[PDB]
Amino acid sequence: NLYFQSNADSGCVVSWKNKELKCGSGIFITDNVHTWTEQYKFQPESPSKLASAIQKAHEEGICGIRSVTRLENLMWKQITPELNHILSENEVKLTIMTGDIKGIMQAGKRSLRPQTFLIDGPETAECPNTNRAWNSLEVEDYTNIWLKLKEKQDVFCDSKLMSAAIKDNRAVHADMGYWIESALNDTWKIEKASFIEVKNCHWPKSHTLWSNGVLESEMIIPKNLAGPVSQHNYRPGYHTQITGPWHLGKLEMDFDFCDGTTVVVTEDCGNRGPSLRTTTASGKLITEWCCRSCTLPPLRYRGEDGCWYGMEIRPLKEKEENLVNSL
Amino acid sequence: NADSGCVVSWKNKELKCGSGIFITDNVHTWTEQYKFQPESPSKLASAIQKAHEEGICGIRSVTRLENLMWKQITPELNHILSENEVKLTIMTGDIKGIMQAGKRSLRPNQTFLIDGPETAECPNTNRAWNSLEVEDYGFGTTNIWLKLKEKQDVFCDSKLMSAAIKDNRAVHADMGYWIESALNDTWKIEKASFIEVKNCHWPKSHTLWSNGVLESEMIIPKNLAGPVSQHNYRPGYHTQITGPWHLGKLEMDFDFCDGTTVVVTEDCGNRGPSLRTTTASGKLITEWCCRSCTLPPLRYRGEDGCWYGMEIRPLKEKEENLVNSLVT
Amino acid sequence: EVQLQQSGPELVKPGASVKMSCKASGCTLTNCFMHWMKQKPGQDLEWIGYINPYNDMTKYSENFKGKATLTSDKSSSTAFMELSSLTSEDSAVYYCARGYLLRTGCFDYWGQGTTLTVSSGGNIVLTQSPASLAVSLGQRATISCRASESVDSYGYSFMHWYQQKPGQPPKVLIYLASNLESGVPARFSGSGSRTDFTLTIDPVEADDAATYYCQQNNENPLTFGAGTKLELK
Amino acid sequence: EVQLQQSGPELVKPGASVKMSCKASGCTLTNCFMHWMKQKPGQDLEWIGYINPYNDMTKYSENFKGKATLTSDKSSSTAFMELSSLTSEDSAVYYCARGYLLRTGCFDYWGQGTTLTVSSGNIVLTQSPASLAVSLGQRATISCRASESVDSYGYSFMHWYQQKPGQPPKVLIYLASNLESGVPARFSGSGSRTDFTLTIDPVEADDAATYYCQQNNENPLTFGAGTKLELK
Ligand SMILES: *[C@@H]1O[C@H](CO)[C@@H](O)[C@H](O)[C@H]1NC(C)=O
Ligand SMILES: *[C@@H]1O[C@H](CO)[C@@H](O)[C@H](O)[C@H]1NC(C)=O
The missing domain is CATH 2.60.40.10 (Immunoglobulins)
Incomplete structure (x- = not known):
């Protein structure tokens, strides 16, 4: 032929562990979670288009919205001064106030439509999630990222942001706020997972490796928390981390011992329950842990306030009542 | 731990540096980036005695790089065989279109045939196939060390496979494949490039969207290392079992063949073996059709011209005058 | 249980840098988060941040990210604090106390204080x-x-x-x-x-x-x- | 049906390069694959390769990858062949013929030949x-x-x-x-x-x-x- 198939990403890359340098053309999945400064910014194409769907929203009886992704909320912070100003010139007595992010970004059952108002913050019964919009933005085009109002109301994370890759038997599912690594050592299992957000949308199988023959009851990161339905989302001896410490919001999951503690495998151990932290509220360390039928190293999370263990890792001797847990 | 470096996207118009996974297109590279080498040529000589002793008369390579390896290596294999005292000559030949599979396998005067053309004296039932897996990597070109597999299965070596999806454009890739998918209204296969055509199975661990797949809808057939994935669909096309895979090295996409036209008509002929747009003598067949396929037409392009998907038949011309792909 | 020893008082010229130290005893990897706080003469206390010398886990409060730099020495289990470009607003008593991570413990044990003179939808309130x-x-x-x-x-x-x-x-x-x-x-x-x-x-x-x-x-x-x-x- | 017009004869010093041309008439995009062959004085014919000026599809035989460079001009539909470092082993008559892709047709029509003189003064x-x-x-x-x-x-x-x-x-x-x-x-x-x-x-x-x-x-x-x- 005479066609140059560089519709892709062209450049060079060096691998520290593999000890080679490779150039060429293809697909580059970058880690947009462990970046030092903000690589991507959310922006709306038309704030006035957004102002329409916000009036229209309250006219539908909607009191507020809950963000899907963290960058959506951070967009809502920079954007709220002008959204209230276009509202002021169009003289609607409805004020937009946006607060900060809880742990999980809970989903809401209402939605905006294309053409006081509380963005995020904590929960409230005066403006419940039943009346909050959620997942009504999709990506338009593009470092900057432009957003537009969505068509249909479904429960799936914006596919235009997701990515996955597998090579040299190391697998990755990635997001603006997720980074899930799996690897082949005897068997395929999850090894690390990084979170800047924890969302409540569904990971679309179109962006999932090995999405066949999965029992959701064995997915480590739960489906309801944007867990990918994949056999890479698997660890032998662990089941879904439904009650993991997802309330930390930003956390680091992996498989190793928490500092100063030990996990043993014993059938005498307690059943799997809500995740406990290794330090009491007073700062005491609980050194001896166990699990009934898990596989070492233990599933451990690390967050802003210390080290937590997977659901199946219980204290060996210490009574659970003295421990901080995630309910 | 990962791949760190920089990348420029011409279509997206940005530059991005960072750390992650870089899937390179190892098919349209200008030089041979990777070469297969054996860890122990002496171990390969041993496992071939046992093969020949068991009645295995030859072997068929899975991947193209495997055949090239058997070429660099046969002078040393015959020298290790001669020093070891055994009247057996190995001669390994060239590659046909499809890399046909054999039903036997290796385990960890008289003649031993590696690849080459087909034969009744040494049929595929009695040839070893897919007995090598990757050990580790060199650096640079870049070396790939191979060793004998512990188990006999039909799955392509996973250490060579890769997949990726970002910007709603997905890729399933290999030392010899490069299969692109994209979301335009719907998810469908768009382009797929081949330097080899192999006869192993694309392992589901390295497959995107591998649930609820019908093999009767996979464009690249499961039997030709087609990935079992809903990224391997195209509306209005079914499995291309009789595509021109004998071409060996070819380029699939969806566009009209130079100088031809496809129309959608219920009067068109039924789907059969893939035909070529130029007759053997060099005449061009300009008018084509298909019963219920969706335009643009599925086309293959190889060193000998432009072929069409199975459902695209000539409109006026009698099919008997055309070259078709039922090559044995 | 833990003993904290801060360095002596420092008198500096405006615009220069200063580095003060705090040496801990009775620490382990799991406790031993060395927090730093600022107290103007007879004022409220500002929280600067913490650094655990065994871990090198660090955190700064937003006000001090350009201002303070926390560094460590695992060997002596000593924390150092550096204070960028100095103004008269930086004159205060700077305390080093042992603490823990976020929803954990209190400031159990305290250093004696280092006296610095420069001469010539939000926070929980x-x-x-x-x-x-x-x-x-x-x-x-x-x-x-x-x-x-x-x-x-x-x-x-x-x-x-x-x-x-x-x-x-x-x-x-x-x-x-x-x-x-x-x-x-x-x-x-x-x-x-x-x-x-x-x-x-x-x-x-x-x-x-x-x-x-x-x-x-x-x-x-x-x-x-x-x-x-x-x-x- | 197709008319091939090759450039005039060339006398070239050893070590230099030469660029000869072939102008095609009555071509279309679909055929018009201009193949190039070398014929030592009273000897066999070697296949150098082809280039289609409309497409710029080109192919070289292995022997000539360092020697020959094929280039094109869509406007005139002219193929050019350039011959890198020249030795008297390169003295030959060089033919330009219309052909097709791989298993297709024959050398339908042929140019008259370009005589290259270098002097100072697989299926078998x-x-x-x-x-x-x-x-x-x-x-x-x-x-x-x-x-x-x-x-x-x-x-x-x-x-x-x-x-x-x-x-x-x-x-x-x-x-x-x-x-x-x-x-x-x-x-x-x-x-x-x-x-x-x-x-x-x-x-x-x-x-x-x-x-x-x-x-x-x-x-x-x-x-x-x-x-x-x-x-x-
Ligand atoms: C791989 O597994 C073995 C045994 O299970 C273990 O000793 C080794 O550290 C593992 N390596 C990894 C997880 O990188
Ligand atoms: C998407 O479909 C439209 C429908 O006509 C087509 O014209 C367009 O070329 C397609 N886009 C791409 C990128 O193939």
């Missing part, structure tokens, strides 16, 4: 009431602390009370809203939940004249009250 | 016989063995050319056994797979020439060594 309070021996002294947002997590109140005599580091009295720190006389008590807490001294005595601070560690940044100056009649 | 086809003398009215038999089948899709991609002195080859038989339009039926070819034979019966006065067999079943395209037929 704690409001203390009253600003000053005068009382006789035997009476009941009541100090209250209002948080603008709940300081509760996991069924605990991450709220603490400290007493500070002049020219001295604070001392822990009540931790977790209501627990009597070991070795503190039972006349001190704390109570409350969510956003409303009260310290009570009953009966107040001759020794108890000091300034009383509430502090929270339910969320970063850590913040203090304005103080309550308690004085005898 | 074996042709038999090398030279052969025969009398008027008798029968000439030339045979061509291919080292591998040149058969594909039920055709034999085997062709026969006649080359009078000082002139490009001409097609006589295409696809092993088909008579090119206007070629006398006294010429006939037969065979399949690896064994082919051209027969002239009866040979006549005009039939004194050198005869080549050629295949295009697999790259590179290859020729026979030639058969010099002489009268008596």
Whole structure:
């Protein structure tokens, strides 16, 4: 032929562990979670288009919205001064106030439509999630990222942001706020997972490796928390981390011992329950842990306030009542 | 731990540096980036005695790089065989279109045939196939060390496979494949490039969207290392079992063949073996059709011209005058 | 359980840099988060951040990210703090205290202080009431602390009370809203939940004249009250 | 149907480069694959490669990857061949012929040839016989063995050319056994797979020439060594 198939990403890359340098053309999945400064910014194409769907929203009886992704909320912070100003010139007595992010970004059952108002913050019964919009933005085009109002109301994370890759038997599912690594050592299992957000949308199988023959009851990161339905989302001896410490919001999951503690495998151990932290509220360390039928190293999370263990890792001797847990 | 470096996207118009996974297109590279080498040529000589002793008369390579390896290596294999005292000559030949599979396998005067053309004296039932897996990597070109597999299965070596999806454009890739998918209204296969055509199975661990797949809808057939994935669909096309895979090295996409036209008509002929747009003598067949396929037409392009998907038949011309792909 | 030793006082020229140190004893990897706080002469305390020398885990409060740099030496288990470009607003007593991660413990044990002279939808705010309070021996002294947002997590109140005599580091009295720190006389008590807490001294005595601070560690940044100056009649 | 116009003769010093041209008329995008061949004085023909000026599809045979560079001009539909570092081993007559892609057609039409003088001041086809003398009215038999089948899709991609002195080859038989339009039926070819034979019966006065067999079943395209037929 005479066609140059560089519709892709062209450049060079060096691998520290593999000890080679490779150039060429293809697909580059970058880690947009462990970046030092903000690589991507959310922006709306038309704030006035957004102002329409916000009036229209309250006219539908909607009191507020809950963000899907963290960058959506951070967009809502920079954007709220002008959204209230276009509202002021169009003289609607409805004020937009946006607060900060809880742990999980809970989903809401209402939605905006294309053409006081509380963005995020904590929960409230005066403006419940039943009346909050959620997942009504999709990506338009593009470092900057432009957003537009969505068509249909479904429960799936914006596919235009997701990515996955597998090579040299190391697998990755990635997001603006997720980074899930799996690897082949005897068997395929999850090894690390990084979170800047924890969302409540569904990971679309179109962006999932090995999405066949999965029992959701064995997915480590739960489906309801944007867990990918994949056999890479698997660890032998662990089941879904439904009650993991997802309330930390930003956390680091992996498989190793928490500092100063030990996990043993014993059938005498307690059943799997809500995740406990290794330090009491007073700062005491609980050194001896166990699990009934898990596989070492233990599933451990690390967050802003210390080290937590997977659901199946219980204290060996210490009574659970003295421990901080995630309910 | 990962791949760190920089990348420029011409279509997206940005530059991005960072750390992650870089899937390179190892098919349209200008030089041979990777070469297969054996860890122990002496171990390969041993496992071939046992093969020949068991009645295995030859072997068929899975991947193209495997055949090239058997070429660099046969002078040393015959020298290790001669020093070891055994009247057996190995001669390994060239590659046909499809890399046909054999039903036997290796385990960890008289003649031993590696690849080459087909034969009744040494049929595929009695040839070893897919007995090598990757050990580790060199650096640079870049070396790939191979060793004998512990188990006999039909799955392509996973250490060579890769997949990726970002910007709603997905890729399933290999030392010899490069299969692109994209979301335009719907998810469908768009382009797929081949330097080899192999006869192993694309392992589901390295497959995107591998649930609820019908093999009767996979464009690249499961039997030709087609990935079992809903990224391997195209509306209005079914499995291309009789595509021109004998071409060996070819380029699939969806566009009209130079100088031809496809129309959608219920009067068109039924789907059969893939035909070529130029007759053997060099005449061009300009008018084509298909019963219920969706335009643009599925086309293959190889060193000998432009072929069409199975459902695209000539409109006026009698099919008997055309070259078709039922090559044995 | 843990002993903290801060470096001597420093007198610096405006615009230059200064580096002060704190050496810890009785630490382990799991505790031993060395926090740093700033106190203008007779003022509230600002939380700068922490650094654990064994881990090199660090955190800064937003106000100080260009200003402070926390570094460590695992070997001696010593923390260092560097203070960028210096202005007269940086003159204060800078305390190094041992603490823990976010919703964890209190400032158990304290360094003696290093005195710095320069010459030639947000934070949780704690409001203390009253600003000053005068009382006789035997009476009941009541100090209250209002948080603008709940300081509760996991069924605990991450709220603490400290007493500070002049020219001295604070001392822990009540931790977790209501627990009597070991070795503190039972006349001190704390109570409350969510956003409303009260310290009570009953009966107040001759020794108890000091300034009383509430502090929270339910969320970063850590913040203090304005103080309550308690004085005898 | 197609007219090929090659550039004038070139006398070149050893060590320099040369760029010769070929201008095509009556081409379309779909054919118009301009192949290039080298013919040492009174020797076999080597296939250099092709370039289609409309497409810029190009292919080189391995021997010429360092030597030849093919370039194009869509506007005039002209192919250019440049010949890198020149030695007297490069002295030859260089032909430009219209052909097709791999298993397709034959060298339909040929340019007149460019004579390159360098001075200061795979499927192997074996042709038999090398030279052969025969009398008027008798029968000439030339045979061509291919080292591998040149058969594909039920055709034999085997062709026969006649080359009078000082002139490009001409097609006589295409696809092993088909008579090119206007070629006398006294010429006939037969065979399949690896064994082919051209027969002239009866040979006549005009039939004194050198005869080549050629295949295009697999790259590179290859020729026979030639058969010099002489009268008596
Ligand atoms: C792989 O597994 C073995 C045994 O299970 C273990 O000793 C080794 O550390 C593992 N390596 C990894 C997880 O990189
Ligand atoms: C998407 O579909 C439209 C429909 O006509 C087509 O014209 C367009 O070329 C397609 N886009 C891509 C990128 O193939």
